[PDB]
Amino acid sequence: KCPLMVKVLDAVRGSPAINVAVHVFRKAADDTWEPFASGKTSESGELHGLTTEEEFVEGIYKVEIDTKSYWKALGISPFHEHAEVVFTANDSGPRRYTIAALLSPYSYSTTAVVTN
Amino acid sequence: KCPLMVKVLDAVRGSPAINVAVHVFRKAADDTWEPFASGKTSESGELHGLTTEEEFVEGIYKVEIDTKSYWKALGISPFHEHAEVVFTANDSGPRRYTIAALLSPYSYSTTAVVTNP
Amino acid sequence: KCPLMVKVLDAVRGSPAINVAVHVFRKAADDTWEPFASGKTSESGELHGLTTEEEFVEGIYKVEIDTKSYWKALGISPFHEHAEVVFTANDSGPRRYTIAALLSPYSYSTTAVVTNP
Amino acid sequence: CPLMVKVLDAVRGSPAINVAVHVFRKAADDTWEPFASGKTSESGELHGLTTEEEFVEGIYKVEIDTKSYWKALGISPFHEHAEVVFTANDSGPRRYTIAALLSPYSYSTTAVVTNP
């Protein structure tokens, strides 16, 4: 039950996307994106350990998912350069955020599940 | 200008899903689905010339989209046999309805928007 | 685990859809949807224990999700009567199937992930 | 109309009206230069924000101001905005259109690309 989990699924093959480059940033006071965390999509597609409740701080985030590498490798030219999910986090306090991403070569979907 | 519209798009190819079969029914009191309308999806991925406002009634409807025939032709083995949307129609009055379909080999999404003519 | 899992989520509340009734129909040789199993979605929005691996057989199935009962409980006017997904199962070997549903008052999405264990 | 942005409201079941749309373009200094801006009509679509001559090969970014739209309608949303980053005109001239299905706490985007 990580405070930020990014479950990633592939709709073309019908299986979880495996080995997708993911990067988490953070908006700073200078309106500049600074690195915050990184990881690799497992066999099941889920992610863990990107941030902890102490490190996870109020502000604006951005989750970057590298669709270019994933579909370039598998031989289908993808449209989107990557995926980005920007959201005001911990606005009302500590909560559990789940970012779900359903990928296609030329489309993707995003969902937030807030446990509160 | 048409009351019910169904739009279908292909997610893997990033294009409208062509030549996709669609069928429409009307719910009956005895829980029997009666053939209502059926057509071939246009090159734009949208249905044209389907139904008229007089044909609509306060009864339930259901629209079926044949995804499996679509994926067989292109050569990808699909998961879904077909897609079905069941919705109570004209509870208030004669309005325009639009059903969106986003097709994938192993998924699809559907959305509904209503309009008042 | 279970050969068939159905997961239901709510878009607007960012929460799993709670207290949603589901019904599973297995097709029969008479082209009739014989009842197969039914369940109640937990607070996690998921459900298990529909059918054992032995109960599953090659054929065509159907999962029906009660959307209006969920919206009537919260009080928004539904568009969709129910959500129905139809797929051939165990076509070659005893693969595992998962059906996910993302619910909004006037839209829903369904995705299926298939694994060979 | 090299680029179009269709924006639909799931809860209301109607095209979203008056959402702020902004378009950026990658620079050699890895900087986003504001390409254009617009406002969505009652149909939920945008037209004339860019021209074919102005639209050239590169990396673009389309941002949709969902934060104001759902706050205006009175429901607190999750996403600060929607970002659709994608390389363009890599293989030559083609018409690009972006569709966004919005809900408070969820959204999906699908691009349909036409060669002519």
Swiss-Prot record, chain D:
Q: A single GO BP annotation from the record?
A: negative regulation of glomerular filtration
A GO cellular component annotation here is: azurophil granule lumen
Q: What happens on changing residue 46 to P? A: In AMYLD1; amyloid polyneuropathy
Give binding positions for L-thyroxine. 6, 45, 108
* Impact noted for substituting residue 82 to S: In AMYLD1; amyloid polyneuropathy
Where is this protein found?
Secreted; Cytoplasm
Residues with 4-carboxyglutamate modification? 33
Sorted alphabetically, the keyword list is: Amyloid, Amyloidosis, Cytoplasm, Disease variant, Gamma-carboxyglutamic acid, Glycoprotein, Hormone, Neuropathy, Phosphoprotein, Secreted, Signal, Sulfation, Thyroid hormone, Transport
Q: What is the effect of changing residue 24 to C?
A: In a patient with amyloidosis
Modified residues annotated as Phosphoserine in this record: 43
User: What would changing residue 24 to V do, according to UniProt?
Assistant: In AMYLD1; amyloid polyneuropathy
Q: Changing residue 60 to H does what?
A: In AMYLD1; leptomeningeal amyloidosis; vitreous amyloid in some patients
Q: What is the effect of changing residue 41 to R?
A: In AMYLD1; amyloid polyneuropathy
What the entry says about domains is: Each monomer has two 4-stranded beta sheets and the shape of a prolate ellipsoid. Antiparallel beta-sheet interactions link monomers into dimers. A short loop from each monomer forms the main dimer-dimer interaction. These two pairs of loops separate the opposed, convex beta-sheets of the dimers to form an internal channel.
Disease field reads: Amyloidosis, hereditary systemic 1: A form of hereditary systemic amyloidosis, a disorder characterized by amyloid deposition in multiple tissues resulting in a wide clinical spectrum. AMYLD1 is an autosomal dominant form due to transthyretin amyloid deposition. Protein fibrils can form in different tissues leading to amyloid polyneuropathies, amyloidotic cardiomyopathy, carpal tunnel syndrome, systemic senile amyloidosis. The disease includes leptomeningeal amyloidosis that is characterized by primary involvement of the central nervous system. Hyperthyroxinemia, dystransthyretinemic: A condition characterized by elevation of total and free thyroxine in healthy, euthyroid persons without detectable binding protein abnormalities.
Q: What does this protein do?
A: Thyroid hormone-binding protein. Probably transports thyroxine from the bloodstream to the brain.
How this chain assembles, per its entry, is:
Homotetramer. Dimer of dimers. In the homotetramer, subunits assemble around a central channel that can accommodate two ligand molecules. Interacts with RBP4.
Q: Identify this protein by name.
A: Transthyretin
Q: What is the lineage of its organism?
A: Eukaryota, Metazoa, Chordata, Craniata, Vertebrata
Span within the full-length protein is 30 to 145 of 147
